[PDB]
Amino acid sequence: AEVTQLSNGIVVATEHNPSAHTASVGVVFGSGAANENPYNNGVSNLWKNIFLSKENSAVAAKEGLALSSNISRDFQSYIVSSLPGSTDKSLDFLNQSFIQQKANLLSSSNFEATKKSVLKQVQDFEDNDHPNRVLEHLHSTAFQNTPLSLPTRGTLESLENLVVADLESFANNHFLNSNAVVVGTGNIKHEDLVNSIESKNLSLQTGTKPVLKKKAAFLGSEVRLRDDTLPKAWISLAVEGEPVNSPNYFVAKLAAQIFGSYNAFEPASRLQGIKLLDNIQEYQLCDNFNHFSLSYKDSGLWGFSTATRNVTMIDDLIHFTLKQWNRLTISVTDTEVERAKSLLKLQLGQLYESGNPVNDANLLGAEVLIKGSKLSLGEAFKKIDAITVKDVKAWAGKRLWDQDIAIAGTGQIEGLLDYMRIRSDMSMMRW
Amino acid sequence: WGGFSVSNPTIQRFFALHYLVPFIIAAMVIMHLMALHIHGSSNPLGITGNLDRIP
Numbered sequence: 053a054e055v056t057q058l059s060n061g062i063v064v065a066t067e068h069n070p071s072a073h074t075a076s077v078g079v080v081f082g083s084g085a086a087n088e089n090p091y092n093n094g095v096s097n098l099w100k101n102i103f104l105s106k107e108n109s110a111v112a113a114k115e116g117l118a119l120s121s122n123i124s125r126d127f128q129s130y131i132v133s134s135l136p137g138s139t140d141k142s143l144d145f146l147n148q149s150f151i152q153q154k155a156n157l158l159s160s161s162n163f164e165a166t167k168k169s170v171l172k173q174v175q176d177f178e179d180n181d182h183p184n185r186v187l188e189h190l191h192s193t194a195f196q197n198t199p200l201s202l203p204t205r206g207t208l209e210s211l212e213n214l215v216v217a218d219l220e221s222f223a224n225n226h227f228l229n230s231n232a233v234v235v236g237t238g239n240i241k242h243e244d245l246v247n248s249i250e251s252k253n254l255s256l257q258t259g260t261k262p263v264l265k266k267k268a269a270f271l272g273s274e275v276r277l278r279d280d281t282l283p284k285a286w287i288s289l290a291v292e293g294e295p296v297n298s299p300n301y302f303v304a305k306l307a308a309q310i311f312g313s314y315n316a317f318e319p320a321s322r323l324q325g326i327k328l329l330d331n332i333q334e335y336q337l338c339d340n341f342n343h344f345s346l347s348y349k350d351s352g353l354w355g356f357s358t359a360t361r362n363v364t365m366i367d368d369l370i371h372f373t374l375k376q377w378n379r380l381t382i383s384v385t386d387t388e389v390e391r392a393k394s395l396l397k398l399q400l401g402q403l404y405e406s407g408n409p410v411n412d413a414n415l416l417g418a419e420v421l422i423k424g425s426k427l428s429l430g431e432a433f434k435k436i437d438a439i440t441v442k443d444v445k446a447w448a449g450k451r452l453w454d455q456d457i458a459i460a461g462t463g464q465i466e467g468l469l470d471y472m473r474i475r476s477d478m479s480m481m482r483w
Numbered sequence: 484w485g486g487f488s489v490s491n492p493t494i495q496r497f498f499a500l501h502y503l504v505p506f507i508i509a510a511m512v513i514m515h516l517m518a519l520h521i522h523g524s525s526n527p528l529g530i531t532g533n534l535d536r537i538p
């Protein structure tokens with residue numbers, strides 16, 4: 053009714069839904085693709101993909117289980133999904149996979165069939181998924197020589213250099229209990245799981261903490277992947293944003309909300325009450341964009357992302373947009389702010405209140421790791437609404453106005469201008 | 484000369500023509516800059532600029 057949180061060594065967390073047809077259990081390791089290193093990159097995405105190799109996934113397929121997995125930057129998750137009654141059928145199959153079995157998934161016929169498929173995997177991504185590719189490199193340059201930089205799915209380089217002796221090197225350090233959280237989502241009780249958990253003995257590497265690295269940092273920089281053979285142009289730009297559990301966590305998400313997200317095709321999109329939109333549409337400066345305030349444990353990235361078949365006029369594209377961003381400091385309409393608060397809520401909803409347990413897991417697992425607990429929607433909303441204009445005019449005033457940016461891109465970006473232009477559009481001339 | 488020698492009708496036309504002409508240079512500097520414009524500047528490498536332009 054307010055989400056449960058109790059620890060007997062294994063911090064056991066759950067979240068009940070009485071109208072759910074199914075449920076899900078799993079673990080979340082409080083160390084992700086940003087706890088790795090330059091040459092072991094993709095180790096966390098390698099771990100995910102053995103966990104779903106036909107072997108272990110045929111086991112749980114007779115049982116009636118489905119497994120879910122994802123790696124982030126600050127965190128890393130291993131979830132299993134099934135019918136709510138077969139709730140022990142989950143917990144046991146989890147127990148087998150992470151304390152019982154070890155080299156049953158770590159075969160020299162398994163691992164050389166997973167790594168020979170996480171290699172094709174990260175060779176369609178950087179090959180044909182430019183919007184994320186661009187998005188990923190954006191981190192690489194903004195957070196260069198620092199934790200967040202390492203692409204979550206790992207470089208094809210440090211991904212052909214890795215054997216099983218390396219899957220473990222990360223496992224036995226960062227796959228602990230004092231870095232994990234067990235989650236219960238969907239259609240199960242707190243007294244169903246934490247019972248079935250204290251039912252099982254053993255302890256893996258107790259007392260052990262996972263290790264640390266130099267805290268992340270940010271620096272104004274570019275990286276440009278020109279490719280004049282690609283029909284469009286993809287660009288992503290940002291400033292040093294705000295972390296998870298930062299005073300302006302919501303203030304910053306409200307700002308993103310204002311300019312928001314465009315799709316020049318859906319007539320619905322064309323009518324949004326966004327000021328910037330007035331400009332961009334005249335000549336069709338782009339095909340779409342969208343904003344964001346990506347928050348991570350140590351640092352953040354407020355900016356936006358755009359694709360465009362309009363090559364001669366990208367220079368305006370970036371211009372109109374970064375000028376709008378100036379208003380946030382000097383001239384944002386209050387009535388804009390309300391449409392923000394309003395729309396944030398709708399978005400922040402379909403995020404948190406989707407009828408899909410697997411999401412409510414990672415969400416829970418990550419948050420109850422970093423701050424300890426989760427924060428309720430009513431808590432969030434109570435904050436969103438407190439937000440004045442002055443909220444947004446002092447946040448932009450430090451974060452946005454005349455601060456270093458972080459551009460990245462690919463496709464026909466000859467037209468995308470230089471760094472002393474772009475960066476300079478962070479401000480406006482004053483008397 | 485306007486007469487027997489470089490005399491008075493001379494320095495007076497030399498003043499007037501001194502006024503006129505600099506506007507002719509400026510007129511001409513404009514076509515000069517127009518030519519410059521349609522090809523853009525060269526480089527201390529005598530190769531093509533079109534791969535690494537800045538504004």
Ligand code: HEM
Nearest residue numbers: 508509511512513515516518519520522523524525526527
């Ligand atoms: C009123 C006198 C002049 C003005 C205002 C002028 C102006 C300019 C300017 C602004 C440029 C671009 C910057 C540069 O490339 O230096 C340029 C380049 C050039 N000028 Fe002139 N100029 C003058 C005299 C001349 C003369 C006397 C010549 C030849 C007899 C000449 C031939 C050229 C050429 C061929 C270029 C291209 C240089 C390159 O490729 O970098 N200009 N001029």
